[PDB]
Amino acid sequence: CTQERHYEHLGRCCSRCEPGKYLSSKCTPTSDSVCLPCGPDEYLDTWNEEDKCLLHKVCDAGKALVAVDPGNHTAPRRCACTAGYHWNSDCECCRRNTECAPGFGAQHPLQLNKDTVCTPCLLGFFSDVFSSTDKCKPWTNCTLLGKLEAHQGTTESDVVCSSS
Amino acid sequence: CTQERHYEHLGRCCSRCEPGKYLSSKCTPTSDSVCLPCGPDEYLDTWNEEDKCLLHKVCDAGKALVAVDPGNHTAPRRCACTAGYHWNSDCECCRRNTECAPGFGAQHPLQLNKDTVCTPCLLGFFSDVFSSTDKCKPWTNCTLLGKLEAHQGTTESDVVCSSS
Amino acid sequence: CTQERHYEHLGRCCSRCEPGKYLSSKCTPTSDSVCLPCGPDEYLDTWNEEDKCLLHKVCDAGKALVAVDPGNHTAPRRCACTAGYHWNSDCECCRRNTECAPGFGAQHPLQLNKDTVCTPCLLGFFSDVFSSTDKCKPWTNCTLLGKLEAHQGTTESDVVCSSS
Amino acid sequence: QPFAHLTINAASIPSGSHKVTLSSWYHDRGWAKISNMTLSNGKLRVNQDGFYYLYANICFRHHETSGSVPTDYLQLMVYVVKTSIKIPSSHNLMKGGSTKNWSGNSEFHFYSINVGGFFKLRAGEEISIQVSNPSLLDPDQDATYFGAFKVQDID
Amino acid sequence: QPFAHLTINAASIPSGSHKVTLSSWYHDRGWAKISNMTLSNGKLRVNQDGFYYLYANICFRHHETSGSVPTDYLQLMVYVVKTSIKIPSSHNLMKGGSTKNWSGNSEFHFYSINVGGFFKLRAGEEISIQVSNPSLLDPDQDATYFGAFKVQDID
Amino acid sequence: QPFAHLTINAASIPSGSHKVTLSSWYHDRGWAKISNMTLSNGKLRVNQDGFYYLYANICFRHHETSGSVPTDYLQLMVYVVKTSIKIPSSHNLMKGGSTKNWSGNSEFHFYSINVGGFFKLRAGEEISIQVSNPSLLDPDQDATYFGAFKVQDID
Ligand SMILES: *[C@@H]1O[C@H](CO)[C@@H](O)[C@H](O)[C@H]1NC(C)=O
Ligand SMILES: *[C@@H]1O[C@H](CO)[C@@H](O)[C@H](O)[C@H]1NC(C)=O
Ligand SMILES: *[C@@H]1O[C@H](CO)[C@@H](O)[C@H](O)[C@H]1NC(C)=O
Ligand SMILES: [Cl-]
Ligand SMILES: [Cl-]
Ligand SMILES: [Cl-]
Ligand SMILES: [Cl-]
Ligand SMILES: [Cl-]
Ligand SMILES: [Cl-]
Ligand code: NA
Ligand code: NA
Ligand code: NA
């Protein structure tokens, strides 16, 4: 019969269970599907026919994970790696963010659960460190120090000021 | 009925098995408990109702364990860590004894299966090493060397003798 | 009955299965042994009564193994450690060949799956390196360099030539 | 037939670096299930005589955001223990684990232990799990668990 | 009763250093066997309801002739996953493995993982294995395998 | 139904650093038990056809009082092997273990292996255990053991 919200069993057409409920007992010849609500910390997000509800994933702080939203009985809990780490699907862990080499800066705004994007330093900016957070900082203005621009700076080093 | 040496089963009051014997077959309506002696290397220390006897622990020399007493059929075998090691309940192994820093000496008598106790060096005594066995040794008497006490010693160093 | 190519079962004397075939169903009172041929990559090398054929070993290149012969349905596949490695029965892996110290050379011809044999350098030959492949090399002939033999060489060092 | 599959109670994992007996598991949640057996604070009690197969999977993990592992000596262990409500002393049925060096520069360290055995259990006898470093326990239901199922009768 | 013991298909082991779901096993060859269950590209499908015992043994190996292991960060893992032909998302049943340092001077490195569990399975549900480093998989039939056998009925 | 749970014979563990087949286990002592199977010098013989579940837990340990582990190359392994009194050659059913670095400054090193599998066994066939470093074997009954129990009939 209907592909959505319905399923066929023993010839007759039965109705599925709404999200938040599981299929306690399937349709008998004398009754329809009996659907009970998901227990504590459990959930189902689709129109299902599952024997039991799924258990919410544990946002383990020991894995540097934190919950963005706890999720309901109809919703999966969503986790993210804490500051400075990004989720890696291969190891299923929070890997350390990639450091940007001198001459390159960490693009801002920094993403929540994503790895650091490294962008080359533009004209007038420099980076002299390896950092996954620090972006390209502007050259020092020698006037602010009451000095003069001796030698111009690069993308890896700042300008040098002389009191001449 | 009686809490000690007796146990109730199927209404009637049966007698338990003495240490050194196990409960082969429990009481029938027409007989009492049948108790057989513990086999080789096996034991039971209390008045029991166990199906079989416990096997004596292995005092593995490979774990630096040694037997204080082998134990009988009514007695648990008792093990201890060999010289220089103490038993640790967390790892269930023979951990290396704690070294006493200079200025501190290992308290004597040294215990069999216990960790080294460190005591500060008293007046007239010193320790110049890290050791879990060596205690505070007395200052050198300069007279015995046919010399004189130049500078007085401390708790971490000996006195110095001069042939003046 | 006959010990070879025959086996007794349920009183009567049945015939075994030839190499390349397995014993699908043993002898019934009304028939003899039913023998089916070994499947793909499978084999049996003797006159057997096995329920199923043995699977050929995997000559894993990841274990530095290589196949000498792939073997048939009546033959085991034979593997060998690649160049520079010998099979070790204890670890069941291809261990690195033993290096011959200076003063010693690797005996030739080098064996396929066997460890390097180290032989002392004879008179007029030397080895100045640790190698599992390099054998004892002959002293340099100073005449070929248009020079003269200053100091004679040893088993660990070459001769030295002077343009005198 | 009786059985049990107990996953770790993620909200009640003990702290510290001392060996403890785990006293909180799930019994009816996710993959956690129990039948004809009773569970009381980490002690899976046998209600029916028989030969059971006992198993345990224990996962240890550590991320660098939690700090650093001290003492340098690290032995991650699991002991499957059979207690009884008639005899005070408890006895190890199965033992597993490994000494580890987690002093590296990597941001994450992981290790899992697995044990399995065929044992003769009587009604009243209890099975419990104890681990060496509870503060390193993986709270995941697929990671840290122990269970049992009856195979044959004693007769 | 239904069962399965699937050994790795040595001629179809994926390459790379990314986690993949293994899609090729032996089912009727050597120790490999299957009964009243169906196998389709690494997905062992359950045909009959019941409580099964699931197990997996995964061996990782590396010889120096193959080169060197890069990145230095090495986490050899195995996930036993339950999928379904009615729900797209898949879920981990069991997890095992260890972080390793294989940057030594030894010519050969080896490590094996083992997991086991008692699970409730319905007809239509599928079990699959995924590993972290498929290029390090041991092709031997005694090394890399996973299986299942029914113990009790659901009722 | 037939079964076996064999713990290591602590008084007959071989010495040396070469791989050997263990030829001494307990069969009726402590947790050690056997039924409808026969044991002859480390060879657990099958007396009744059927599908069995085979398992083994092997623990390796080393304390510094015993000296030091030489050669630096250390691969702790376990092979579960099926022999037969009709064919001379033997074959590995299951394999497990790990390469280890036990050259640290710690006083104690420990490592356990676990393997499990569902196999089809005939009467006359024998199961045996072989380990790489017998001198490192843990003599404890909860540490080093192997067993088997029948699940289904062959038919
Ligand atoms: C949780 O439930 C509320 C109910 O209104 C719903 O709006 C929300 O979308 C659910 N959360 C998620 C992540 O689906
Ligand atoms: C061993 O048996 C003897 C019997 O006289 C007893 O005295 C002794 O206490 C037993 N040993 C222990 C440790 O109980
Ligand atoms: C493979 O089969 C051929 C058939 O002629 C036989 O001659 C050969 O000996 C077999 N190979 C081995 C290694 O036995
Ligand atoms: Cl619960
Ligand atoms: Cl037992
Ligand atoms: Cl196949
Ligand atoms: Cl389940
Ligand atoms: Cl015995
Ligand atoms: Cl088989
Ligand atoms: Na930078
Ligand atoms: Na001191
Ligand atoms: Na040489």
Reported as half-sphere exposure (CB side, CA atoms, 13 A), residue A138 has a value of 3
Which residue does chain F place closest to C46, by CA atoms?
F87
The distance from CA D12 to its chain's CA centroid, rounded to whole angstroms, is: 14
Q: How far apart are the first and last CA of chain E?
A: 15
DSSP code at position B145: G
For residue C78, give both structure tokens: 């034979």
The whole-angstrom separation of Cα E35 and Cα A45 is 34
Burial D52-73 (b: 16+ CB within 10 A, else e): bbbbbbbbbbbbbbeeebeeeb
Compute the distance between CA of residue B112 and CA of residue D66 in angstroms, rounded to an integer.
Answer: 38
Instruction: Assign D65 to helix, strand or coil.
Output: helix
From the list A54, A57, A62, the residue facing D61 with the nearest CB is A62
Give the residue from E59, E64, E154, E51 showing the smallest Cα distance to E93.
E51
DSSP category for residue E42 = T
Task: Please give the Cα distance from E66 to C61 (Å, whole number).
Answer: 8
- What domain count does chain C have? 2
Phi, psi of C144 (to 5 degrees): -65, -20
Cα distance between residue D5 and residue F93, in whole Å: 27
Separation in Å, CA D83 to CA D87, D91, E41: 8, 7, 45
Burial class (CB in 10 A: 0-12, 13-18, 19+), D145: buried
Chain B closest-CA separation from residue F133 CA (Å): 13
CA distance B120 to B108: 13
Say if residues E121 and E154 touch (Cβ distance below 8 Å): no
User: ∠ at Cα E58 (E55, E62), nearest 5°?
Assistant: 175
Task: Pull the structure tokens for residue D108.
Answer: 């994450």
Report residue E3: phi and psi, to 5°: -160, 175
Count CB neighbours of A31 within 10 A: 10
Pair (B123, B162) in one structural domain: yes
Decide the pairing of beta strands F3-8 and F145-152: antiparallel
Q: Looking at beta carbons, which pairs linking A48-53 to residues 24 or more positions away fall under 8 Å?
A: A48/A16, A48/A17, A48/A19, A48/A22, A48/A23, A48/E86, A48/E87, A49/A7, A49/A16, A49/A17, A49/A23, A49/E86, A50/A17, A50/A22, A50/A23, A50/E87, A51/A22, A51/A23, A51/E120, A51/E122, A52/A22, A53/A22
Taking the C-alpha atoms of residue D102 and residue D82, their distance in angstroms, rounded to an integer, is 31
Please indicate whether residue B75, judged by its CB atom, sits closer than 6 Å to ligand 2.
yes
Tokens 């693009």 sit at which residue? A107
Rounded to whole angstroms, how far apart are CA atoms D102 and E130? 25
CB-based neighbours (< 5 A) of ligand 9, an ion: E 31; F 119-120
Residues D104-132: b if buried by 16+ CB within 10 A, e if exposed: eebbbbbbbbbbbbbbbbbeebbbbbbbb
State the smallest CA–CA distance between residue C55 and chain E in angstroms. 5
Q: What gap in Å lies between CA A64 and CA B79, rounded to an integer?
A: 43
**Cα separation values, E24 from A91, B73, C120, E39, Å:** 22, 56, 52, 9
Task: Return d(Cα E85, Cα C29) in angstroms, integer.
Answer: 49
B93 and B71 fall within a common domain: no
Say how far apart CA C77 and CA E28 lie, in whole Å.
19
Are B11 and B32 in the same domain? Answer: yes
- The backbone torsions φ and ψ at residue E98, rounded to the nearest 5 degrees and listed phi first, read -160, 145
Residues 6+ apart with CB under 8 A from A112: A68, A80
Q: Which residue minimizes the CA distance to atom 12 of ligand 1?
A: A75
Single out the residue in C81, C114, C129 at which a domain terminates. C81
Residue C54 with chain E: CB contacts under 8 Å: 30
CB E148 within 8 A of CB E52: yes
For residues B41 and F26, the answer to whether their CB atoms sit within 8 Å is no
Locate the chain F residue with the closest alpha carbon to E142: F94
Instruction: Enumerate the residues of chain F whose CB falls inside 8 A of the CB of residue E5.
Output: 117-119
Place of tokens 């096995």: C50
C152 and C116 part of one domain: yes
In the Cβ-directed half-sphere of D144, how many Cα atoms lie within 13 Å? 27
Cβ-based neighbour number of residue A108 at 10 Å? 11
Residue F43's DSSP bridge partners are: F40
Q: Where is the domain boundary, B62, B81, B100?
A: B81
User: Hey, what are C149's tokens?
Assistant: 């033999």
Give the pair of three-digit tokens for residue E79: 């996930």
Residue ranges per structural domain of chain F: 1-155
Q: For tokens 């000494």, what's the residue? A: D99
**C-beta neighbour count of F151 within 10 angstroms:** 19
Q: Identify the helix (H) or strand (E) that includes residue C140.
A: none
Q: What is the CA radius of gyration of chain C?
A: 28
Quick one: B127 and B57 in the same domain? no
Torsional class of A41: left (φ above 0), alpha (ψ -120 to 50), beta (otherwise): left
Closest CA to D3 of B12, E120, C49: E120
Beta strand residue intervals within chain C, DSSP E: 6-8, 13-15, 21-25, 34-37, 42-43, 54-55, 65-69, 78-81, 85-88, 93-96, 104-106, 118-120, 125-126, 137-138, 148-151, 160-162
Q: What does the alpha-carbon distance between residue F130 and residue F77 come to, in Å, rounded to a whole number?
A: 8
Same domain assignment for residues C7 and C66: yes
Q: Give the experimental resolution in Å.
A: 2.7
Letter for the amino acid at A74?
A: T
**DSSP per residue over chain F, as a string?**
--EEEEEE-TTS---SSS-EE---EESSBTTBEEESEEEETTEEEE-S-EEEEEEEEEEEEEEGGG----SS-EEEEEEEEEEESS-S--EEEEEEEEEE---SS-SEEEEEEEEEEEEEE-TTEEEEEEES-GGGB---TTTSEEEEEEEE---
* Protein residue with least CA distance to atom 3, ligand 1: A72
First to last CA, chain B: 89
Task: Return the bridge partners of C160, or none.
Answer: C151
Q: Are residues B117 and B135 in the same domain?
A: yes
Whether residues A86 and A163 fall in one domain: yes
Residue written as token pair 């890290």? B130
Burial status of residue C88 (CB atoms within 10 A of its CB: 0-12, 13-18, 19 or more) = middle
Total count of residues recorded for chain C = 164
Which structure tokens are listed for E36? Answer: 């009243």
Establish whether residue A71 lines the binding site of ligand 1, counting it when its CB lies within 6 angstroms of any ligand atom.
yes
Q: In the 3-class helix/strand/coil scheme, how is chain A assigned residue by residue?
A: CCCCCEEECCCCEEECECCCEEEEECCECCECCEEEECCCCEECCCCECCCCCEECCCCCHHHCEEEEECCCCCCCCEEEECCCEEEECCCCEEEECCCECCCEEECCCCCCCCCCCEEECCCCEECCCCECCCCCEECCCHHHHCCEEEECCCCCCCCEEECC
CB-based contact B75:B46 (threshold 8 Å)? no
Query: Cα(F111)–Cα(D96) distance, rounded to whole angstroms?
Result: 8
Q: Which two tokens stand for residue C25?
A: 């169903």
What is the rounded distance in angstroms from the CA atom of residue C86 to the CA atom of residue D8? 47
CB of E59 closer than 8 Å to CB of E108:
no
Question: What is the spatial distance between Cα C134 and Cα E102, in angstroms, rounded to a whole number?
Answer: 29
Which of F18, F87, F135 to substitute to test the interface with C, most C CBs within 10 Å? Answer: F87
C-alpha span between A113 and E34 (Å, rounded): 43
Asked whether the beta carbons of residue C50 and residue F87 sit closer than 8 angstroms, the reply is: yes
Distance CA F100, CA E112 (A): 12
**Eight-state DSSP code of residue D135:** G
Task: Identify the burial level of C99 via C-beta atoms within 10 angstroms of its C-beta, where 0-12 means exposed, 13-18 middle and 19 or more buried.
Answer: middle
B153-162 burial code (b ≥16 CB/10 A, e <16):
bebeeebebe
Cα distances from A23 to residues A127, D4, E82, in angstroms, run: 59, 22, 18
Please name the chains neighbouring F, where neighbouring means 3+ C-beta pairs under 8 angstroms. Answer: B, C, D, E
Of the three residues B31, B57, B81, the one that is the final residue of a domain is B81
Handedness of CA D122, D123, D125, D126 (dihedral sign): positive
How many C-beta atoms surround the C-beta of residue C83 within 10 A?
12
Kindly list the distances between the CA atom of residue A55 and the CA atoms of A73, B101, D7, F53, in Å, as whole numbers in the listed order: 10, 53, 11, 31
Q: What is the DSSP letter of D119?
A: E
β partners of residue A119: A105
Residue B95 token pair: 């951990």
Domain with residue A75: its CATH number is 2.10.50.10
Q: Is the CB of C142 under 6 A from ligand 3?
A: no
**CA–CA dist B90, B117 (Å, integer):** 19
Q: How was this structure determined?
A: X-ray
Q: What is the DSSP string of E126-151?
A: EEEEEES-GGGB---TTTSEEEEEEE
Q: Which residues of F touch E110 (CB under 8 A)?
A: 75, 77, 97-99
Cβ–Cβ gap E141/C40 under 8 Å: no
Q: Residue B51: left if φ>0, alpha if ψ -120 to 50, beta else—which one? A: alpha
Six-digit token string for B74: 């009514």
Q: What SS3 state is found at C80?
A: strand
**Does the Cβ of C69 fall within 6 Å of ligand 3?**
yes
Atom of ligand 2 nearest to the CA of B69: 13
C101 is in an annotated binding site: yes
Which amino acid residue places its CA nearest to atom 9 of ligand 1? A75
The answer to whether the CB of B149 falls within 8 A of the CB of B124 is no
* Sign of the alpha-carbon dihedral angle for F83, F85, F86, F87: positive
Say if domain F1-155 classifies as CATH 2.40.50.140: no
SS (H, E, C) B13-82: EEECECCCEEEEECCECCECCEEEECCCCEECCCCECCCCCEECCCCCHHHCEEEEECCCCCCCCEEEEC
> Which of E3, E69, E68, E57 has the alpha carbon at shortest distance from E35?
E3
Q: Which domain, by its residues, includes C104? A: 82-164
